[PDB]
């Protein structure tokens, strides 16, 4: 009975020894590492003896006792490097009120480095040293778990404190978040305890990233007012041959993507948090791009109207390019899988940008409005001089076809050099928008110049509309043909508006109805 207590004494004595294995058996000494191995051997033998002979329900066996001693050493080890962080770091690494500070994060970066040295030491030394129970005792594995867990407890508390006072640059919080992710993924993420993930660490830094985003938006919005002036001062030059937009466009999206790339490198493993960053950054993209549009749409006229006309086209191309490179970001932020409220704001942004390209195109087309009205009054005058010339030599006769050409000649001289210039320097959509707009403008002006309805006059008592003065048969025919020709002129054999669009154009239908009042001479009953 005095033997069983003599054994317990010995078992306990070795427990004390191993509970400080690192300090008692330095990795520097190979022979001391051997002694450590001998010490574990002796412990198991004592345990094996007790389990075979005695039947005290078996206290460990061995592996669980050593494990608990190793966990102890780690708790002590963590305490050591926490209290001696500064000295340990500056002595081995490098390039007062020590311990955690609230004015700087330096202490935590140095602590991480020391933590790694410990884990690495337990992997490279000790683990091969203590190889008695490979299935059940991996010192390096258990070193990483304990060291991370002890570090996580302090880091969580530190960031809650930093949340209240802020005081450090957003950069410094951002980098620490990055360095922690590296530590977690390198040593912890593939551990049984943690494998199920949803790790807690990103939540510690969440308010610091949001702040960085808040600062980032105000930085981007600042970079905007600058990319545009640099472009405007350079005179919105087309970049290169097949890129119909200017430099301010590539500058903005490089800035937006660099910023997004920062969030991406965080590799946030908490989707709920990832949705938060995406929801916030989407607001940044919106406010930046909308500002680009709002900046341009507030200056568009001054470049347009009076020649030249290249710049207004490019400004529209730019605005279109915003639309295409947004969608490219939408996929980069993982479209469809993207947070709903985030994709919602971006899809509401594609609409706003679209409804700006339209507004812009309308302003541009209207810059031709006066000259068009002049060309249309000119073509109404020519039409009014259309006569039948029967009893007259066959060479002096002007045909319906020749007459229609003469009617359209003013407006064609106007548009020719233009349409031609566009299409050459507009994206398809930009060109189509301008043509659709110029189309509506020509049809409307024609409806309100050559074919204004008869006026009202007081008839007997109650103001009736007068009878329309019918065009002559030759006049009707010249109108019809000229009209049909403009349509083909805007179709342009498959570069202009589609024939389906022109036909169902409500502006063409109104002009045809207006025309119908005057064209009674040739209109068929029974069509």
């Amino acid at each position: 009975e005095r033997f069983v207590k003599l054994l317990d004494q010995l078992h306990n004595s070795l427990r004390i020894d191993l509970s400080m294995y690192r300090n008692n058996f330095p990795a520097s000494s190979p022979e001391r590492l051997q002694d450590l191995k001998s010490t574990v051997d002796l412990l198991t033998s004592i345990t094996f003896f007790r389990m075979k002979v005695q039947e005290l329900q078996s206290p460990p066996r061995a592996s669980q006792v050593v494990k608990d001693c190793v966990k102890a050493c780690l708790n002590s080890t963590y305490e050591y490097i926490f209290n001696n962080c500064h000295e340990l770091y500056g002595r081995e690494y490098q390039t007062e009120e020590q311990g955690p500070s609230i004015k700087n994060l330096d202490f935590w970066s140095k602590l991480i480095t020391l933590i790694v040295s410990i884990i690495e030491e337990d992997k490279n030394s000790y683990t091969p040293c203590l190889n008695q129970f490979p299935q059940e005792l991996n010192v390096g594995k258990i070193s990483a778990e304990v060291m991370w867990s002890l570090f996580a407890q302090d880091m969580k508390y530190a960031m809650e404190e930093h949340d209240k006072h802020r005081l450090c640059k957003s950069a410094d919080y951002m980098n620490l978040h990055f360095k922690v992710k590296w530590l977690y993924n390198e040593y912890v993420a593939e551990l049984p305890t943690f494998k199920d993930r949803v790790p807690e660490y990103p939540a510690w830094f969440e308010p610091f990233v949001i702040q960085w985003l808040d600062e980032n938006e105000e930085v981007s919005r600042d970079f905007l007012h600058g990319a545009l002036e640099r472009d405007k001062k350079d005179g919105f030059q087309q970049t290169s041959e097949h890129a119909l937009f200017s430099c301010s466009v590539v500058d903005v999206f490089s800035q937006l993507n660099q910023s997004f790339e920062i969030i991406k490198k965080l590799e946030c493993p908490d989707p709920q948090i990832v949705g938060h960053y995406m929801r916030r950054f989407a607001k940044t993209i919106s406010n930046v791009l909308l500002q680009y549009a709002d900046i341009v749409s507030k200056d568009f006229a001054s470049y347009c109207s009076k020649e030249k006309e290249k710049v207004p086209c490019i400004l529209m191309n730019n605005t279109q390019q915003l639309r295409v490179q947004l969608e490219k970001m939408f996929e980069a932020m993982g479209g469809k899988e993207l947070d709903a409220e985030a994709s919602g704001t971006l899809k509401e942004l594609q609409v706003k940008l679209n409804n700006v390209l339209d507004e812009l195109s309308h302003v541009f087309a209207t810059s031709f409005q006066p000259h068009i009205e002049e060309c249309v009054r000119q073509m109404g005058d020519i039409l009014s001089q259309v006569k039948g010339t029967g009893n007259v030599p066959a060479s002096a006769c002007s045909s319906v076809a020749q007459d229609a050409d003469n009617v359209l000649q003013p407006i064609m001289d106007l548009l020719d050099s233009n349409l031609t210039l566009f299409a050459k320097i507009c994206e398809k959509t930009v060109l189509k928008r301008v043509l659709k707009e110029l189309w509506k403008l020509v049809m409307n002006t024609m409806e309100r110049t050559i074919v204004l309805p008869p006026e009202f006059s007081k008839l007997k008592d109650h103001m009736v509309r007068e009878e329309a003065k019918s065009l002559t048969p030759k006049q009707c025919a010249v109108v019809e043909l000229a009209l049909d020709t403009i349509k083909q002129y805007f179709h342009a054999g498959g570069v202009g508006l589609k024939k389906t669009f022109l036909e169902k154009s409500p502006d063409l239908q109104s002009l045809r109805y207006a025309l119908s009042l005057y064209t009674q001479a040739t209109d068929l009953l029974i069509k």
């Binding site: 548009l415 020719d416 050099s417 233009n418 349409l419 031609t420 299409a423 342009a492 054999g493 570069v495 202009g496």
Partner: peptide, 6 residues
């Protein structure tokens, strides 16, 4: 000529 050929 047609403005869309050149």
């Amino acid at each position: 000529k047609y403005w869309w050929k050149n």
